[PDB]
Amino acid sequence: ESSMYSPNAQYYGSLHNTAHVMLGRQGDPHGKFNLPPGVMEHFETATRDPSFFRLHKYMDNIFKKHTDSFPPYTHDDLEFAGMAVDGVAIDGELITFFDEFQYSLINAVDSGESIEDVEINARVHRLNHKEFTYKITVSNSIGSDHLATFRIFLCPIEDNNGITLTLDKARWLCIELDKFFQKVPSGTHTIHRSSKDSSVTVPDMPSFHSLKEQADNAVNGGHDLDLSAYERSCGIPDRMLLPKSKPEGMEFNLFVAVTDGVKDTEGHNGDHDHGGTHAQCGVHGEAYPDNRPLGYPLERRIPDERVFDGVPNIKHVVVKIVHHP
Amino acid sequence: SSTAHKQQNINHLLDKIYEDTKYPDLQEIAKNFNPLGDTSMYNDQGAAAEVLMKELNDHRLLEQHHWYSLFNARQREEALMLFAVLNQCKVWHCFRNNAAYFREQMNEGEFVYALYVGVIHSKLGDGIVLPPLYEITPHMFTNSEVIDKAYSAKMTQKAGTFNVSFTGTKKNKEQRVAYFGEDIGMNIHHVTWHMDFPFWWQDSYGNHLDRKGELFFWVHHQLTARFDFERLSNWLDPVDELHWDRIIREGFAPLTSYKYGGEFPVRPDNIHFEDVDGVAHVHDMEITENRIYEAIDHGYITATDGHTIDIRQPKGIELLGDIIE
Ligand SMILES: *[C@@H]1O[C@H](CO)[C@@H](O)[C@H](O)[C@H]1NC(C)=O
Ligand SMILES: [Cu+2]
Ligand SMILES: [Cu+2]
Ligand SMILES: [Mg+2]
Ligand SMILES: [Mg+2]
Ligand SMILES: [Mg+2]
Ligand SMILES: [O]
Ligand SMILES: [O]
């Protein structure tokens, strides 16, 4: 990155952070023009720049050489004994669209001494999607109910040239859609999971105006302020859960891995509240609740798809996403 | 000397063009006919036949079973010597007998070319339909893989029909529009236009080709515009223009072969033009280009003695086609 956890910054330096600055300053690399830092030199702005993603794919491939170095998982590595994913389905169509969102620009303008404010807003078009529900039918043939981790990814089927991807060629392109822990009772049952409850996403933030209104009303009235329903600001926006896709529709693989929750959450309790954004943002003030490597079970090479196809607790199905322009 | 007999004669002459003729009548003619025996059959009283026979007798003609290119100056000159003889024949028996005689003496590529333009540009050819060149010389229209299956079908003496796929791979975005330039009929359109309107035409051959230089502009403008419409249909940008001082971005592997001469050469992506020994320096192309643009921007073409030929007039585009081709 590097962080202050680095055991040896004198030798390994700070590749990623220095690269942000190197790229950010390429419009004035020697300081001759008195230009300020580039958008790459702020986390507020860095993803605006196309080169952000070329830099971060470069970095991602460094990590990938490490994750590719381990032995591929075996059947016995992956099998959650007695747990079968019988079916994966979605209630509701997968549809994306653009809608409108407003925020205030008042803090950006200069206020006169004893002249009144005026409302000044920006209106942006943002991606969004309709709500839907996963229906994951699992058969628990162990003699008792068992905690399970449900891991949900969206994976490409074909590339931009229309070439069908192998699982090994798809896995590093998959995007995480959800991760949750749930007790699976003995027998066959369909687990229902709302898109709105994804542990990858969080809602749009409440406005400054709304926070002022609520705090002022509580302080002025002597009432307690309860903002506990508000989620953290770390997490993919709910509205961006799905890729835009195309008006004509695109097909993707919806990948579901159901893994041993007692093992995955050992030491972190499978009954405890892990918040709304634990997949990538962790749990505020707590250890990370999933002991598995980030990306499990897609983070190792899969040279032989037969291994995954023979694991009953893994299943993928084709879904279609349509963009409504 | 009727259309049925003339068509059959042409059919026979073009049959199995890489081997000595299998028709007893044509073998007899090739053995016994003397192109110089009765000069009263020619409009030039044998002048063209004398030129070709001298070249033949001096062992100066291209051997059979050898590649032929119309752009090769000496090979073109040899083909045109046979064209010149056919073009002088007053009656069909002269045309047929000379064709049969020189079929067995001259390179097959030169012969096919001369016979086609001879039929097209002689009144004796009226009413004849030339077979498609993709069946007379299939190597020039068929990728090497399919020819090999044909060679295999012949080696094994088994009939078959073999599927031709377009060149390249799906990773090659240019393959998206291969159905345009690789269409066998589009190839016949192109060769036939140039057979109808050849750059080597001189009006001493018997007539003038009206507006040829402007039609040269137009037919190629339409090929270019039609190709770009296919690119637009396949989510591709228009073609760039070539420039002598910039790289040719898109390379090409034809995956095709000559019957004699080997595989057609490949061009890698992103190459700069190099001088071609015996043809021209890249710089010569730039100078030639500059001189043409000088005429366009002057509004006149400069004659050999320096006097001006006005092109600010409807025939200017035709004169430009004359000097550009
Ligand atoms: C060739 O194409 C035809 C139809 O286009 C098809 O019936 C046949 O299966 C193809 N042959 C091979 C070997 O793919
Ligand atoms: Cu970064
Ligand atoms: Cu042409
Ligand atoms: Mg959430
Ligand atoms: Mg297996
Ligand atoms: Mg040679
Ligand atoms: O970043
Ligand atoms: O970052």
In three-state secondary structure terms, A113 is coil
| φ and ψ of A85, to 5 deg | -90, 105
* B115 plus B199 within the same structural domain: no
* Tokens linked to B259: 């019957």
Distance CA A319, CA A91 (A): 11
* B6 plus B149 within the same structural domain: yes
Domain boundary among B141, B166, B191: B166
In three-state secondary structure terms, A81 is coil
Per 3-state DSSP, what percentage of chain A is helix, strand, and coil (rounded to 5)?
Answer: 25, 30, 45
Distance CA B103, CA B107 (A): 8
- Give the helix/strand (H/E) hosting A152: strand A146-156
Report yes or no: A195 and A131 within 8 Å, Cβ to Cβ. yes
What technique was this entry resolved by?
X-ray
Report the candidate in B122, B103, B126 with the shortest Cα–Cα distance to residue B16: B103
* B172 plus B96 within the same structural domain: no
Please list the residues that pair with A141 across neighbouring strands: none
Distance CA A259, CA A271 (A): 16
How many C-beta neighbours within 10 Å does residue A98 have? 15
Distance CA B273, CA A46 (A): 41
CATH code for the domain in which residue B302 is found = 1.10.1280.10
Distance CA B84, CA B70 (A): 15
Give the number of the ligand closest to the Cα of residue B199: 3
Is the peptide bond between A104 and the residue preceding it cis, with omega within 30 degrees of 0?
no
Q: Which residue is associated with the tokens 């004359």?
A: B322
Distance CA A177, CA A151 (A): 8
Q: Between β-strands A187-194 and A201-202, what pairing exists: parallel, antiparallel or unpaired?
A: unpaired
| φ and ψ of A6, to 5 deg | -60, 130
Report yes or no: B17 and B137 within 8 Å, Cβ to Cβ. yes
Chain A positions contacting chain B at CB under 8 Å are 161-163
Q: What DSSP designation does A159 have?
A: -
Is the peptide bond between A156 and the residue preceding it cis, with omega within 30 degrees of 0?
no
Distance CA A250, CA A286 (A): 39
Q: From the CA of A268, how far away is ligand 4's center (Å)?
A: 19
Distance CA A216, CA A222 (A): 10
CATH 2.60.40.1520 fits A70-99+127-204+224-325, yes or no: yes
Domain boundary among B142, B166, B190: B166
Structural domain range at position B306: 167-325
Report yes or no: B103 and B97 within 8 Å, Cβ to Cβ. no
Distance CA B141, CA A76 (A): 55
In A, which residues are within 8 Å of B170 by CB distance? 161-163
* B150 plus B100 within the same structural domain: yes
Q: Could you write out the three-class secondary structure of chain B?
A: CCHHHHHHHHHHHHCCCCCCCCCHHHHHHHHHCCCCCCHHHECCCCHHHHHHHHHHHCCCCCCCCCCCCCCCHHHHHHHHHHHHHHHHECCHHHHHHHHHHHHCCCCHHHHHHHHHHHHHHCHHHCCCCCCCHHHHCHHHHCEHHHHHHHHHHHHCCCCCCCCCCCCCCCCCHHHHHHHHHCCHHHHHHHHHHHHHCCCCCCHHHCCCCCCHHHHHHHHHHHHHHHHHHHHHHCCCCCCCCCCCCCCECCCECCCEECCCCCECCCECCCECCCCECCCECHHHHHHHHHHHHHHHHHCEEECCCCCEEECCCCCHHHHHHHHHC
Say whether B173 and A161 touch across the interface (CB within 8 A).
Answer: yes
* B96 plus B142 within the same structural domain: yes
Q: Between β-strands A187-194 and A133-140, what pairing exists: parallel, antiparallel or unpaired?
A: antiparallel
Report yes or no: A135 and A88 within 8 Å, Cβ to Cβ. yes
Distance CA A251, CA A280 (A): 26
Distance CA A171, CA A295 (A): 10
- Give the helix/strand (H/E) hosting A278: helix A278-281
Report yes or no: A17 and A2 within 8 Å, Cβ to Cβ. yes
Number of A–B residue contacts, CB under 8 Å? 6
Domain boundary among B112, B145, B166: B166
Question: Entry resolution in angstroms?
Answer: 1.6
* B148 plus B227 within the same structural domain: no
Distance CA B88, CA B45 (A): 9
CA distances from A72 to A7, A68, A293, A298, A312 (A): 29, 8, 14, 10, 18
Distance CA B257, CA B144 (A): 6
Report yes or no: A9 and A23 within 8 Å, Cβ to Cβ. no
| Identity of the amino acid at A315 | K
Distance CA A174, CA A200 (A): 14
* B191 plus B101 within the same structural domain: no
Residue B143 C-alpha, separation from nearest chain A C-alpha, in angstroms: 23
Q: From the CA of A94, how far away is ligand 4's center (Å)?
A: 18
* Tokens linked to B125: 């050819």
In B, which residues are within 8 Å of A161 by CB distance? 170-171, 173
Residue A161 C-alpha, separation from nearest chain B C-alpha, in angstroms: 6
Alpha carbon of residue B145 to chain centroid: 24
Distance CA B14, CA B11 (A): 5
Distance CA B97, CA B100 (A): 5
Q: Between β-strands A121-129 and A236-237, what pairing exists: parallel, antiparallel or unpaired?
A: unpaired
* B201 plus B128 within the same structural domain: no
Q: Into how many domains does chain B fold?
A: 2
Q: From the CA of A268, how far away is ligand 5's center (Å)?
A: 29
Q: From the CA of A280, how far away is ligand 4's center (Å)?
A: 11
Report the candidate in A142, A143, A101 with the shortest Cα–Cα distance to residue A122: A101
B208-211 own/partner pairs: CB under 8 Å, 24+ apart: B211/B318
Distance CA A304, CA A306 (A): 5
* B134 plus B252 within the same structural domain: no
> What number of CA atoms fall less than 13 Å from residue B115's CA on the CB side?
32
* B299 plus B225 within the same structural domain: yes
- Give the helix/strand (H/E) hosting A151: strand A146-156
CA torsion, ordered A236, A238, A242, A243, to nearest 10 deg: -60
Distance CA B132, CA B138 (A): 9
In three-state secondary structure terms, A240 is helix
Say whether A163 and B170 touch across the interface (CB within 8 A).
Answer: yes
Q: What residues contact A209, with CB distance under 8 A and at least 6 apart? A: A104
CA torsion, ordered A36, A37, A39, A44, to nearest 10 deg: -100
* B316 plus B174 within the same structural domain: yes
* Tokens linked to A247: 């008006």
Q: Could you write out the three-class secondary structure of B24-47?
A: HHHHHHHHHCCCCCCHHHECCCCH
Q: Between β-strands A314-323 and A236-237, what pairing exists: parallel, antiparallel or unpaired?
A: unpaired
* B322 plus B242 within the same structural domain: yes
Q: Between β-strands A236-237 and A175-184, what pairing exists: parallel, antiparallel or unpaired?
A: unpaired
